Design an enzyme around this catalytic site. Structure first.
Site, PDB file in Angstrom:
ATOM      1  CB  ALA A 199      10.731   0.903  -2.372  1.00 31.28           C
TER       2      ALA A 199
ATOM      3  CB  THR B 287       8.143  -7.742  -4.138  1.00 28.16           C
ATOM      4  OG1 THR B 287       8.155  -6.378  -4.078  1.00 28.16           O
ATOM      5  CG2 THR B 287       9.039  -8.091  -5.285  1.00 28.16           C
TER       6      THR B 287
END
Ligand code: 04C
Ligand code: MG
Ligand code: NA
Lengths: 233, 240, 222, 250, 235, 231, 212, 244
Positions: free
Chosen positions: G49, G1
């Protein structure tokens, strides 16, 4: 967290046209020491199920007591205990499988590999495996330990898939099992010559055979073997 | 643990323990709350059968819950300390998690919730206390005045009184307080509060306490001489 | 020391169409270099037109499926036999998985069915509960082999329109159930060739508004 | 199941009386007379051994009990309640003092702990008060000799001399006439035997009377030698023979 | 005295029956269910004119699709609302959807009988739970301290309940519009209320699929009161 | 009189009045009927409403795919007991892969109700239940009373005026027991049975509640327009 | 990310990538890393996540309960602190979350709060979080001005994610843009890097390191 | 069950009074009178022992006056056993405060906490309240010399001069008559004894039926000293004021 002490080796089994066969030797090993020789590792539950257990013997004796207690508890307030509401192999298995997985999840497993062989009330053959991890699976042939490596290959030559089961007789199936037990005695260092065998048929019922021995062994060819290569004498 | 259900329903549909807790409030010294255009004033009676008191150290009737909210009460004095303490803790806890001081409605709602819990919890009796909670929300100039009672119900009031002879002073406030035009200044609001207490009190000496709360954590308690000036002024206008 | 986890191998695959969805998985079960079963199903009909598979550690996978099936049962009891939507089932599964965040279920989970608009839906999960809806997903041991093939053949990735100078992409379009099953079968035969834990048999569960249908195909047994 | 009595069984009546404490004191009044006298060099505690049956061996039942080597106790009222109090009193002397300071508690503090136990039976849930009044005689280095009375309420008072139980009113009057601040221990034992004869009705000898003293250290009763600082218990129970010797010169 | 969870000889729980008497003393609350929405209305009943009536909160939001009106010991309702709100939001978290109105009511009613010797006494408040879901549409529920709940087409609770319920019996039909229902609540409230009905001592609310649960303003209710008076004078 | 303050007290004649008062709550409840053949078991329940504006209180609850009951008395108590049954049925499935026998279901309810009649603080359950089910020994019908007493029957009825339906079933015993392989006819017999307990009111479309379980029939409930067939 | 969010003249820009990794395995390219908590509150995700997904959805439930109880939309400060106090309770257990709570309220104005799994909570105008945060900072810092237009600010946020998506091996897929004003958040589309890169390269004349 | 035997100690009367608290106060009204008088340069504590016996050991006795710490003392009226439970709690609470803040506990804080404990017994737990009224006499650097009283209700108030126990009505009238604000300790000593001497139920007030204590700044420079009077010291102070 455990470590197994007194142990039992392979348990082998297979389906045939009318029922199932299961077998296991009568040894209780203490590491490399072949300590106990009168150990029964096949335990019948009723007249329609046999539970074959390998691994830790103290944990096996615990499971014996659970099954013994299960029969008692099922009889309570049950007029059909010896009829419609008798214990099925599928009931006995699911109970053990629940226990095995609960114990592994508490990080205190029963150090065993179990095969539940039997015949259901509708005549269907039951054969399913469960181990210390709570892992379950079913197959026309099932085996634990060294049996998985050496017996299954031999038993799968007889019953390679589902369609081969109706084609397999009890005479053929028992012959394959007894042959497999011999091969294990040749090659498994924690096995014994003496063993027990059980047949659960949908017609003839439960036949429990004790004090069997491995026989018709080939050792003669050993006389011709010298040294490890160049040794002529 | 002591489990007994002390607060329970009776055949006629009343919870007597809650209703008897209201009688304790009725016995308590009078307390009055009047909110003006830009302020709230909390007036409190102090019974004069107690001379040789030490007013420096004696617990004051009006308590600060935070720098911007105050709480006065009528009823059992010992019971009020428990509510005040809980309220003060919740005030700091709210600042800690929400990063903002409590609204007066929220603080009232909490105190009322505590009072209610003691009406259907085993082993406990209800609080023999009704409270007047007044103040100003953070970054707000609209005055707030709330009332609670033993049952746990709470509501907002333009002006309200509780305690002994409260029905007399409520009668006074009901005709003297105009909704369309509340006390425009601090002086007007304090005077109306003192007037209302003078219907019930006895003498305007060391019997009346007055606390004025203004926006942005501006709270001050009036002294004897300051209050006595209102008492002197009201009596001279009365003789007419 | 006792190791509570194991690897039972196998691989699974879910594809979504316009008015259907498939969830496929091989029937092989293994430990180390041994085969336990050549036919041990791991794709299940869980009711309310939802099919589910939890591939990885079988004991954890069976436990999860068992818990979700039970979750569906109690959803009916508690909410007047209401049908559990695929999106609601996905969220429920996240909570089942995340409840064991610090002692995880070692499984890659996939569910398939139809959304509330009647269109095909595939949801996939990591072992601790993260989920996402997709048209396509492979899970398990051979997921790394199969997934890029699906990217190419289902979502037409890296495929451009001939003669357009690589400027116009091949347009996205739904596939027929017949085309999807071709991709599933080719995916699994390819995976069986190069992955030792994949083989024996292939069981596909197809989901339409009419219900759940099954299809079985043999795979190489070596 | 479980103790559902989590509420007080002793409560204030409209008149301000604590009924159960008053009634416990009534039970003490019915009890056999016991007394205590403090001398300059010792303390004496005494009581009558009321035998339940002549077949019963009254030696096995000990009304006067050792709490520490330098502290003794006697009672009037309900014997069973006394017995458990002695057990608790002996234990508390260890747990709340000796195991902390490595020495036995002074009389006043042990008395304070016993009082605490009896007070809790007056306020705690689902229990009645103890039906006994204790007389605790003892010695410690910094306070010297002392004598205390402990009532069912948990209140305790220090005494020069006193009596409790059946004929306490008459016995206290007798002690007031005889007691002075120059009494030697032997003189106090003599007065104790005189005071007790008034309340006793039947036989009056060493087998029907139980009497102990808190006096000089007894190295012979210690059980070992070799530590100079350890000189033996000041508590000594007078034998049946030792009592009869003093009854001749009475 | 006697046990809290004791049965009477007629086969009823004393405390539950006594709590029902407390609810009869409470202020009137009316609910009407239509195919265009569910309307909820209450009598505020200020004990004194100095009390700021807009602080009287007897109609309450549980979720965007579920509203609630109360009557009786209204302080007891706070923990019931808190539970309902948490139940609604929690279900949305677990299942990514709105919770059924019936399921919500059932969850609230599970608290009701959790008393004895758990809380010390039953709740002294009745609730009218109105809402909408995709399955069963617009619904109105009456939740009691007995743990029982009935669905209603229309229902009145409180001091003027038996008189208002008889009126609702005649007036309700399956083709009522929302506007017709609004006026009907105002009409029946004005009949059973002690003091004269206006925008300050009575409050209206509704729940519709499109806009969700909305409490009406005092300006909006005032126009409906004026519309009601004109229509009654018109024949 | 002096011996009805709580369940822990016996009367001088050996009666438990709190249990008897709980039994009284069932008699006030609306009528419900149970009957079975050898292939199917049927519950028929007359639902009750508060008034014309209200709904009709749901009497029948599903416990498993092969078992369920009807209630008469305190509905919240039925919810507690039905929930307990759901869990016990479910425990049997998850642990033993075994459908819970209808007889064991009764034994479990008996033991749960009993504990409430012997301890201080608690109270007896104020509801009666009719449990039907199909298991490995065919069709079954049970009658649960909150005293703890559970009874297996061919047919029965509980609630107000249940004596009318109970007499009818006692006459019809030989007929309805042999309605094998015919659901609609067994229901008809049940609907005719509950009709013997009706006074002034008759069976309407949103009044009647029917449930059925059998050999090749999961436990399913019929309400609304689905029961119009049987009026 | 790679996630960013910066404050400027015309409100707040929020931009994120869409890649999910399992080691060097690309698990997904189409993941949602922004959660719309309410019409005025956004939450960015970075780290595990499941932790991000689970606890930020849970955060939204807590923010909903606040406005039910208090009849008022929760502040950005209070919303961020609920999450930071939650993860602090789990401190040491192994949660991995890099979050940014972005939103507007009347009392606060446009506000951004950085919250991570070791309990750090910081108010600020510019933040970049994730494995590719440094790559985004490089472009964002060197082009940032307070007086950027809504059009230019949207592009800079998009371009900063693109920069990181390119260099960072654990970032990519597509860019999800958001713009937060006094009227609430506004979604400005999903932008696939497969097309966006070549479009930017051609039009901007940048990315000269790559073979054109 | 056990409900049958529950007195319900923590409930309201129809009039809104706490039965047990009222009855505990009735109990305290029969206890030996205790007086506290606060002067500008110290505090006096005086208390009358309950009907003494001539064989009671007077010098090694403690019934009325107890020491909480070096700066704070209490006079007791009621059940001694109950008071000792509360005193040991108060002694511990003082040491907890000192351990936490490295400062001696302010008098009011100690008084409030002890009063809060009493309050708890009137609202929950189903136990009887403590049948005790305290007079707290102490000093701290915020308010200086302070007198407080607490009673079974858990309500506490501050005083210049106050009495508890028996004949408080008569005692309070006499204190209210002769007390003034510029009073010294030695004057307060005389007032305390004169008040007891008139309100006593005994024939004549003697040294053996009294406990006495002063809290002065009569030590050396800016520090407080507690003086629990010995028997001979009470005998002398009784002669010095001309009571005997
Ligand atoms: C970039 C891609 C760097 O990885 C982002 O941080 C991305 C953020 C994100 C947020 C929401 C939804 C998807 C993606 N993070 C990941 O992709 C994340 C990387 C990661 C894994 C593990 C970590 O420590 C626990 C920290 C970061 N990837 C995953 O979570 C993948 C999908 N799942 C797993 O690794 C499953 N593991 C997680 C840890 O617990 C055991 C199972
Ligand atoms: Mg292969
Ligand atoms: Na990474």
């Amino acid at each position: 967290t455990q470590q197994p002490i007194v142990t039992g080796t392979s348990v082998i089994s297979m389906k045939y046209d009318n029922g199932v066969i299961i077998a296991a030797d009568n040894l209780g090993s203490y590491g490399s020491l072949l300590r106990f020789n009168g150990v029964e590792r096949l335990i019948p539950v009723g007249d329609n199920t046999v539970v074959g257990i390998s691994g830790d013997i103290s944990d096996m004796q615990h499971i014996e007591r659970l099954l013994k207690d299960l029969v008692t508890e099922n009889a309570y307030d049950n007029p059909l205990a010896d009829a419609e509401e008798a214990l099925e192999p599928s009931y006995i298995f699911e109970y053990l499988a629940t226990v095995m997985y609960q114990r592994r999840s508490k990080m205190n497993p029963l150090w065993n590999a179990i095969i539940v062989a039997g015949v259901q009330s509708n005549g269907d053959q039951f054969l399913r495996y469960v181990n210390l991890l709570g892992v379950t699976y079913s197959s026309p042939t099932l085996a634990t330990g060294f049996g998985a490596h050496m017996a299954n290959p031999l038993l799968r030559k007889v019953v390679d898939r589902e369609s081969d089961i109706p084609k397999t007789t009890v005479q053929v199936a028992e012959e394959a099992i007894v042959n497999a037990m011999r091969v294990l005695y040749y090659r498994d260092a924690r096995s014994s010559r003496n063993f027990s065998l059980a047949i659960i048929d949908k017609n003839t019922g439960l036949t429990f055979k004790k004090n069997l021995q491995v026989e018709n062994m080939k050792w003669d060819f050993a006389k011709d073997i010298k040294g490890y290569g160049t040794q002529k004498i | 643990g002591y489990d007994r259900a002390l607060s329970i329903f009776s055949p006629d549909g009343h919870i007597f323990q809650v209703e008897y807790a209201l009688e304790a409030v009725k016995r308590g010294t009078c307390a009055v709350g009047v909110k003006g255009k830009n302020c709230v004033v909390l007036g409190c009676e102090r019974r004069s059968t107690l001379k040789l008191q030490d007013t420096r150290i004696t617990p004051s009737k009006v308590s600060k819950i935070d720098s911007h909210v105050v709480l006065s009460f009528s009823g059992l004095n010992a019971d009020s300390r428990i509510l005040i303490e809980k309220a003060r803790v919740e005030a700091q806890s709210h600042r800690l998690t929400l990063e903002d001081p409590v609204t007066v409605e929220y603080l009232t709602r909490y105190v009322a919730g505590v009072q209610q819990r003691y009406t259907q919890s085993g082993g406990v009796r209800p609080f023999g206390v009704s409270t007047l909670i007044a103040g100003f929300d953070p970054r707000d100039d609209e005055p707030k005045l709330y009332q609670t009672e033993p049952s746990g119900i709470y509501s907002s009031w333009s002006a309200q009184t509780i305690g002994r002879n409260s029905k007399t002073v409520r009668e006074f406030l009901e005709k003297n307080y105009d909704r369309k035009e509340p006390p425009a200044t601090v002086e007007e609001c304090v005077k109306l509060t003192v007037r209302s207490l003078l219907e019930v009190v006895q003498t305007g000496a060391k019997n009346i306490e007055i606390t004025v709360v203004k926006p942005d954590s501006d709270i001050v308690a009036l002294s004897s001489e300051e209050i006595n000036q209102y008492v002197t002024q009201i009596e001279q206008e009365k003789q007419e | 020391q006792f190791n509570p986890y194991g690897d039972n191998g196998g691989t699974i695959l879910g594809i979504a169409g316009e008015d259907f969805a498939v969830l496929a998985g091989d029937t092989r079960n293994i430990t180390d270099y041994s085969i336990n079963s050549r036919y041990e199903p791991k794709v299940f009909d869980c009711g309310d037109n939802i099919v589910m598979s939890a591939n990885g550690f079988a004991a954890d996978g069976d436990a999860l499926v068992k818990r979700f099936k039970n979750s569906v049962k109690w959803y009916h009891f508690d909410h007047n036999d209401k049908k559990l939507s695929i999106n609601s089932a996905a969220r429920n599964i996240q909570h089942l998985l995340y409840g064991k965040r610090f002692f995880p279920y070692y499984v890659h989970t996939i569910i398939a069915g139809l959304d509330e608009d009647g269109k095909g839906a595939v949801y996939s999960f990591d072992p601790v509960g993260s989920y996402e809806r997709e048209q396509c997903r492979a899970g398990g041991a051979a997921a790394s082999l199969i997934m890029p093939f699906l990217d190419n053949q289902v979502n037409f990735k890296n495929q451009y329109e001939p003669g357009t100078n690589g400027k116009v992409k091949k347009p996205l379009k739904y596939l027929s159930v017949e085309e999807v099953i071709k991709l599933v079968r080719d995916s699994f035969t390819s995976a069986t060739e190069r992955h030792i834990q994949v083989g024996d048999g292939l069981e596909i569960l197809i989901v339409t508004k009419d219900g759940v249908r099954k299809e079985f195909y043999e795979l190489k047994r070596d | 199941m479980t103790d559902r009595y989590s509420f007080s069984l002793t409560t204030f009546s409209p008149s301000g009386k604590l009924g159960q404490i008053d009634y416990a004191l009534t039970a003490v009044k019915q009890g056999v007379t016991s007394l205590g006298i403090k001398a300059t060099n010792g303390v004496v505690i005494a009581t009558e051994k009321k035998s339940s049956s002549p077949l019963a061996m009254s030696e096995t039942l000990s009304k006067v009990s050792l709490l520490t080597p330098d502290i003794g106790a006697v009672y009037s009222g309900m014997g069973p309640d006394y017995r458990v109090l002695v057990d608790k009193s002996r234990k508390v002397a260890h747990t709340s003092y000796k195991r902390i300071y490595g020495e036995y508690p002074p009389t006043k503090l042990l008395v304070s702990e016993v009082a605490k136990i009896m007070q809790e039976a007056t306020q705690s849930g689902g229990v009645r008060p103890f039906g006994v009044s204790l007389l605790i005689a003892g010695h410690d280095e910094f306070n010297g000799f002392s004598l205390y009375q402990v009532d069912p309420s948990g209140s305790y008072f220090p005494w020069k001399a006193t009596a409790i139980g059946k004929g306490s009113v008459a016995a206290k009057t007798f002690l007031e006439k005889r007691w002075n601040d120059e009494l030697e221990l032997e003189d106090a034992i003599h007065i104790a035997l005189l005071t007790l004869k008034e309340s006793v009705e039947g036989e009056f000898n060493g087998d029907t009377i139980e009497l102990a003293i808190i006096g000089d250290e007894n190295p012979d009763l210690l059980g070992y030698t070799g530590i100079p600082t350890d000189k033996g218990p000041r508590f000594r129970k007078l034998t049946s023979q030792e009592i009869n010797d003093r009854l001749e010169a009475l | 005295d006697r046990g809290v969870s004791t049965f009477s000889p007629e086969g009823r729980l004393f405390q539950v029956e006594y709590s029902l008497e407390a609810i009869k003393l409470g202020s009137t609350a009316i609910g009407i269910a239509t195919k265009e929405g569910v309307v909820l209305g209450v009598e505020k009943r200020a004990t004194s004119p100095l009390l700021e009536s807009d602080s009287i909160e007897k109609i309450v939001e549980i979720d965007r699709h579920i509203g609630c009106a109360m009557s009786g010991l209204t302080a007891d309702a706070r923990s019931m609302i808190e539970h309902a709100r948490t139940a609604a939001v929690t279900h949305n978290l677990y299942y990514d959807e709105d919770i059924n109105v019936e399921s919500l009511t059932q969850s609230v009613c599970d608290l009701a009988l959790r008393f004895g010797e758990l809380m010390s006494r039953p709740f002294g408040v009745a609730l009218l739970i109105a809402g909408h879901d995709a399955d069963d549409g617009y619904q109105l529920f009456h939740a009691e301290p007995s743990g029982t709940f009935y669905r209603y087409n229309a229902k009145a609770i409180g001091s003027g309940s038996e008189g208002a319920q008889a009126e609702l019996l005649n007036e309700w039909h399956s083709s009522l519009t929302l506007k017709e229902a609004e006026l009907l609540v105002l009409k029946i409230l004005k009949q059973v209320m002690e003091e004269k009905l206006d925008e300050n001592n009575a409050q209206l609310s509704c729940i519709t699929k499109q806009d969700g649960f909305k409490i009406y303003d005092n300006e909006k209710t005032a126009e409906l009161i004026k519309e009601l008076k004109e229509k009654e004078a018109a024949e | 009189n002096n011996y009805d303050g709580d369940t822990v007290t016996f009367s001088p004649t050996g009666r438990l009045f709190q249990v008897e008062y709980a039994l009284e709550a069932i008699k006030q409840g609306s009528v419900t009927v149970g009957l079975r053949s050898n292939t199917h078991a049927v519950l028929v329940a007359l639902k009750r409403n508060a008034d014309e504006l209200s709904s009709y209180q749901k009497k029948i609850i599903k416990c498993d795919e092969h078992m369920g009951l009807s209630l008469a008395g305190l509905a919240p108590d039925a919810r507690v007991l039905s929930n307990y049954l759901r869990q016990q049925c479910n425990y049997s499935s998850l642990v033993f892969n075994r459908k819970l026998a209808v007889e064991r279901a009764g034994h479990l309810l008996c033991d749960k109700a009993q504990k409430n009649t012997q301890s201080y603080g608690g109270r007896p359950y104020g509801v009666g239940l009719l449990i039907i089910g199909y298991d490995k020994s065919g069709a079954h019908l049970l009658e649960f009373q909150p005293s703890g007493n559970v009874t297996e029957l061919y047919g029965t009825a509980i609630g107000a005026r249940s004596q009318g339906a109970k007499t009818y079933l006692e006459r019809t015993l030989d007929t309805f027991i042999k309605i094998d392989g015919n659901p609609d006819e067994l229901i008809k017999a049940g609907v005719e049975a509950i009709s013997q307990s009706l006074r002034d009111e008759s069976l309407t479309v949103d009044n009647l509640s029917i449930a059925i379980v059998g050999k090749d029939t999961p436990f399913t409930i019929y309400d609304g327009e689905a029961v119009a067939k049987y009026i | 990310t790679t996630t960013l969010a910066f404050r400027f003249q015309g409100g707040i820009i929020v931009a994120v990538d869409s890649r999910a990794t399992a080691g060097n395995w690309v698990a997904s390219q189409t993941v949602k890393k922004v959660i719309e908590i309410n019409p005025f509150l956004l939450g960015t995700m970075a780290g595990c996540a499941a932790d991000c997904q689970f606890w930020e959805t849970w955060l939204g439930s807590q923010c909903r309960l606040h406005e039910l109880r208090e009849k008022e939309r929760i502040s950005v400060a209070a919303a961020s602190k609920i999450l930071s106090n939650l993860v602090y309770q789990y401190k040491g257990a192994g949660l991995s979350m890099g979050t940014m709570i972005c939103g507007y309220t009347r009392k606060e104005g446009p506000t951004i709060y950085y919250v991570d799994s070791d309990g750090t909570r910081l108010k600020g105008d510019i933040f970049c979080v994730g494995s590719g945060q440094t790559f985004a900072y490089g472009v964002l810092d060197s082009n940032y001005k307070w007086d950027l237009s809504v059009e230019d600010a949207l592009y800079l946020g998009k371009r900063s994610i693109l920069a990181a998506a390119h260099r960072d091996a654990y970032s990519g897929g597509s860019v999800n843009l958001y713009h937060v004003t006094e009227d609430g958040w506004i979604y400005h589309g999903n932008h696939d890097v497969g097309e966006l890169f070549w479009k930017v390269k051609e039009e901007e004349g940048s990315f000269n390191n790559v073979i054109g | 069950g056990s409900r049958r035997y529950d007195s319900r100690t923590t409930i309201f009367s129809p009039e809104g009074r706490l039965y047990q608290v009222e009855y505990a106060l009735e109990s305290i009204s029969h206890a030996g009178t205790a007086i506290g008088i606060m002067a500008s340069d110290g505090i006096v504590l005086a208390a009358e022992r309950k009907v003494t016996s001539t064989l009671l050991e007077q010098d090694t006795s403690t019934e009325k006056l107890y020491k909480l710490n070096d700066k704070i003392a209490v006079a007791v009226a009621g059940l001694t056993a109950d008071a000792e439970i509360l005193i040991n709690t108060a002694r511990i609470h003082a040491q907890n405060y000192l351990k936490t803040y490295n400062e001696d506990i302010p008098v009011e804080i100690l008084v409030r906490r002890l009063s809060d404990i009493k309050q708890g017994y009137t609202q929950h737990g189903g136990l009887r309240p403590f049948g005790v009224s305290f007079i707290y006499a102490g000093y701290d650097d915020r308010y200086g010399y302070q007198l407080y009283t607490s009673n079974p209700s858990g309500n506490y108030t501050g005083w210049k001069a106050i009495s508890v126990g028996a004949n408080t009505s008569a005692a309070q009238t006499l204190l209210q008559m002769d007390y003034k604000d510029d009073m010294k300790v030695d004057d307060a000593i005389e007032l305390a004894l004169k008040t007891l001497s008139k309100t006593t139920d005994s024939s004549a007030l003697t040294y053996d039926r009294l406990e006495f204590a002063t809290i002065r700044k009569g030590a050396n420079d800016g520090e407080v000293y507690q003086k629990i009077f010995k028997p001979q010291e009470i005998k002398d102070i009784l002669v010095k004021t001309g009571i005997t």
